Each structure stands twice: as structure tokens, then as C-alpha cells.
Design a protein around this ligand. Structure first.
Ligand SMILES: CCCCCCCCO[C@@H]1O[C@H](CO)[C@@H](O)[C@H](O)[C@H]1O
Lengths: 442, 48
């Protein structure tokens, strides 16, 4: 095992005279996946700019000036390659998966997109109504509105509070211009990363990129990367009620440290302890995760998930459960009790497993090419370089009990949480109560 | 008629100072817990 890790090939990295960082992991696999990952999200938008990046995503594929829609689509389909992508609050990306016999072709396709989207005044107007619709579909997914609302209130009044898709007004009116304005402002080499994994050999990649990414920086701005305005967390709640729904959704959380910070490992290990449930499990005997056990014994919920979603300089460490109108309270009671237990009286027997369960994730985090690429893409972009499983190992292979406590309690104990809840939530006690559910009557 | 007198008053003093100090504290405390409501904000959003 340790050897298996030790024998895992290093991930080549190198920046251009441009600013783009080109990294990759050579394997053998006849297939592979390459793509660019941008240092851009909704976080970077304005009150009037917000949604661009997304409006933009829906056009990124519909063709370039160098080769219109009918073609781009035809050329990719024709080579059996897959082009897909996404955009969060601080992180966007476009990736392709082909037979590593096409690094050069893929690489070119990529560039041609992150640099020359047609932005056909005629296509735009179409996607405009496609989103407004797609948006009204994202809506009934109470599992997502809830998180949005969480962020909303959690980081109320700041860039983070804005949802990645954006208001209908913005989408109804963004101009062919604004989109261009968003592209030419954030899609710059210094903030972008060209990553890959497969049978591809670094050099052929570099050159190929160094060839199609012919960007040139004049001034110093171009060459530099602007740091964002800090986001203020706020212990608060938001309740979107409607007994009209089948069941309720709840999400509570404290502020997170941020990528850079190490503790995100100990903290990542703690969540592995409370883990997650889901009525399709087979386990009233689930190892620890009493929250799950209890959830089963007393029928506390349909499911729940522990999460340490983080950003550049902040984040959200919390949990979210889906439950029936009548078991909302106990569930919250029992869970919120686990955080305390977590940081007030944890045990080695627990952390031991915690670790293992993580390591197994940590590894399956890299199952395939597309996913690996995702790490290189991210890692660089958010951490600075790449963290080898061999490393993550140690980092989280030396977390003892006392370590979990010290930290969890450092981030959870007597902190003013941020809760959000849509659906039939009459039974969810007031803030004050969930608040004083943040300190154990030790 | 009331030998207490002096004792009863020195006592009255001490009580007055406690009321003085105790009520404002619990007042601030009462005000503190409540704020979550006094400040609260409703909104009605029918999907129309
Ligand atoms: C609710 C507020 C209650 C105030 C406290 C009551 C104080 C009573 O204090 C009394 O003061 C006397 C005079 O010095 C002493 O002789 C007594 O022993 C003492 O008990």
C-alpha cells in the first residue's frame, strides 16, 4: 500500500512565458481527459454582472468564430471525444475526454473556446430563455435551493451570497457585451490551468499548449492575479416555509478555514466520523455514525450529509438533513448533539476508522482520468501545486483523538451557526434554541 | 416600637442597590435573547 502510493508517478507541472500552468499525470490508459480550469466563479460577478459566467457556460460549446456550431459539435462528436464542464462560486472548468491520441487536437479545441466563443447575438437570445427555464427546474430541487439559501444568509451581503446561476432579471437582460466583458476579464492565462492525465506525455502537451495558447502580457496587471474582497460570515437563519411540501430540508453550519489551512484535514476527518445516512443502507448497526444509527432506531430522517465545503479564504463546515414534517426536531437535536460529542469527548477508536474511511475516499477521489485531471486542475488553482496521495496520507494519517477535539471545538463550540430550512418546518425550534445547542452542559 | 429600624433600613439600602444592578442585567439579558425576533424580517413569496 504505502509502496503503491510511493510508486505512484509524479505530476509534472510547468508555467509558460505566458502565465498558464500546464500540469498532468501520465498513466498508460489509451484514453485520457484534458481541460482548463479557471480561477473564476460567480463570486467574481457584480450585482449586475452576476450570471454572466453561467450565461457564458451555456454558449462555450455552441461554436467559435474559427469554427461555428454545426462544425465544433460535428468535429468533437466525430472523434468520439466528450466535452463537458461547470462553474461554481470560485472555480470554473471545461474538459474533454478522448484517446490521448488527440492531446494536440483536444488542446486546440479547448483554447479555441476559452478564447473565441462566437457569442452569436442570435444564439445568446436563445440560451437566455433556455436558462430561465433550466433555472425554474433547478428550483424544485429543494436539495439545492436549501444550500443556496444557506450561502445566501451565511455570507449575506457579500460576493459569496450570490447564487452561481444568478437572478432571472440579470439573465433576462445580460448583453452580448457583458458576456464578452466577463470573458476578456477573467479568462487569463495566469488564472487558468491546462491539466491532463492518461497516456499523454508532458512535453507533447506543453508544446501543444505553448503553441495554441499564444497569449502575450504587456503591463504588470495582466501578469498579476487580483485577490478578492473577504466575505463576512454571519450567524443567522433563513426560513422558507411551506407545509405544501412532502418533507423538510435543514442545513446548519459554521464558518470554514479555507483551502490553504491544514486543519481542513483534521476537520475533514471529523466529518468522516458523523458520516451520512440514506434509507437505502442496511444498518441499524452502522459503525458509529450514531447519527445514522439513531436516525434508524428513532426514524429521524430520510438522509443527511456532513460536508466541509471550502473556498479561497473561507468556507462552510456543517450538515444537512431531509426529514418528515414531524421528526425535524429530534433529528436536529440528536445531530447537533454529535458535533458537541465530536469536539468534547471523541475517542481514538473513532478517529482511527474516521481516517481509514477518508483514505478510502481520498483514493477513490482519483478513480479514472477525468477525476484525476480534476485534482490537478483544482489542487494547483487552490493549493498552489499538487498534493500526492502519498502526502494527503501523512497529513491525515497523523490525526489522533485530541486533535479532532481541539479543532472541531475550535471551529464549532459556542459559535453562532447559520441555518436554512425550506418545506414544512413548523417544528424546527427557534434560533436561540439551535444556538444554545452549540454548547454542551459539560 | 420597632427596634429593627436601623437594621431594616441599612437592609433597605442594600436591596435598592441590588434591584438597581439586578434588573438592568436581566433587562439586557431579556433584550438580548429577544432581539432575534424584534429584528426579524418576514416576506411573502407566492409563486404567482
Ligand atoms: C433581591 C435583592 C436582595 C438584596 C439582598 C438583601 C440584603 C440583606 O442583607 C442584610 O444586610 C444587613 C445590614 O448590613 C445585615 O445585618 C444582614 O446580616 C444581611 O443579611
Amino acid at each position: 500500500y504505502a509502496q503503491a502510493l510511493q510508486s505512484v508517478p509524479e505530476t509534472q507541472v510547468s508555467q509558460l512565458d505566458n502565465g498558464v500552468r500546464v500540469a498532468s499525470e501520465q498513466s498508460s490508459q489509451p484514453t485520457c481527459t484534458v481541460g482548463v480550469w479557471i480561477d473564476a466563479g460567480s463570486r467574481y460577478e457584480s450585482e449586475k454582472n452576476n450570471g454572466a459566467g453561467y450565461f457564458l457556460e451555456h454558449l462555450a460549446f455552441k461554436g467559435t468564430k474559427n469554427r461555428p456550431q454545426n462544425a465544433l459539435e460535428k468535429e468533437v462528436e466525430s472523434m468520439g471525444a466528450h466535452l463537458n464542464a461547470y462553474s461554481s462560486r470560485e472555480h470554473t472548468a471545461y474538459y474533454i475526454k478522448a484517446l490521448s491520441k488527440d492531446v494536440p487536437k483536444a488542446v486546440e479545441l479547448l483554447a479555441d473556446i476559452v478564447q473565441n466563443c462566437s457569442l452569436e447575438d442570435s444564439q445568446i437570445e436563445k440560451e437566455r430563455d433556455v436558462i430561465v427555464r433550466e433555472l425554474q427546474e433547478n428550483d424544485t430541487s429543494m436539495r439545492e435551493v436549501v444550500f443556496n439559501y444557506l450561502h445566501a444568509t451565511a455570507f449575506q451581503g457579500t460576493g459569496l451570497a450570490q447564487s452561481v446561476e444568478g437572478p432571472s432579471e440579470n439573465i433576462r437582460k445580460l448583453s452580448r457585451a457583458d458576456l464578452t466583458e466577463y470573458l476578456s476579464t477573467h479568462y487569463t492565462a495566469p488564472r487558468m490551468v491546462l491539466a491532463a492525465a492518461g497516456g499523454v506525455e508532458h512535453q507533447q502537451l506543453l508544446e501543444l499548449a505553448q503553441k495554441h495558447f499564444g497569449g502575450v502580457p504587456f503591463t504588470y496587471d495582466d501578469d498579476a492575479v487580483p485577490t478578492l474582497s473577504k466575505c463576512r460570515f454571519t450567524g443567522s437563519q433563513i426560513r422558507h416555509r411551506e407545509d405544501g411540501l412532502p418533507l423538510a430540508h435543514v442545513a446548519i453550519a459554521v464558518e470554514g478555514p479555507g483551502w490553504a489551512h491544514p486543519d481542513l484535514v483534521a476537520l475533514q476527518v471529523a466529518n468522516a466520523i458523523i458520516g451520512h445516512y440514506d434509507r437505502t443502507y442496511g444498518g441499524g448497526l452502522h459503525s458509529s455514525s450514531p447519527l445514522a444509527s439513531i436516525a434508524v432506531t428513532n426514524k429521524l430522517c430520510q438522509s443527511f450529509q456532513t460536508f466541509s465545503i471550502c473556498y479561497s479564504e473561507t468556507g462552510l463546515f456543517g450538515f444537512y438533513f431531509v426529514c418528515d414534517r414531524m421528526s425535524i426536531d429530534d433529528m436536529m437535536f440528536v445531530l447537533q448533539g454529535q458535533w458537541m460529542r465530536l469536539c468534547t469527548s471523541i475517542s481514538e477508536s473513532e478517529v482511527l476508522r474516521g481516517k481509514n474511511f477518508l483514505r478510502n475516499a481520498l483514493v477513490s477521489h482519483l478513480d479514472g482520468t477525468t477525476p484525476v485531471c480534476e485534482d490537478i486542475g483544482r489542487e494547483l488553482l487552490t493549493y498552489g501545486r499538487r498534493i500526492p496521495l502519498e502526502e494527503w496520507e501523512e497529513r491525515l494519517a497523523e490525526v489522533d483523538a485530541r486533535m479532532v477535539r481541539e479543532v472541531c471545538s475550535k471551529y464549532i463550540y459556542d459559535q453562532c451557526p447559520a441555518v436554512a430550512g425550506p418545506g414544512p418546518i413548523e417544528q424546527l425550534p427557534d434560533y436561540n434554541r439551535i444556538r444554545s445547542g452549540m454548547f454542551w452542559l459539560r | 416600637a420597632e427596634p429593627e429600624h436601623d437594621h431594616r433600613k441599612r437592609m433597605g439600602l442594600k436591596m435598592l442597590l441590588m434591584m438597581g444592578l439586578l434588573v438592568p442585567l436581566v433587562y439586557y439579558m431579556k433584550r438580548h435573547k429577544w432581539s432575534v425576533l424584534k429584528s426579524r424580517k418576514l416576506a411573502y413569496r407566492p409563486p404567482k
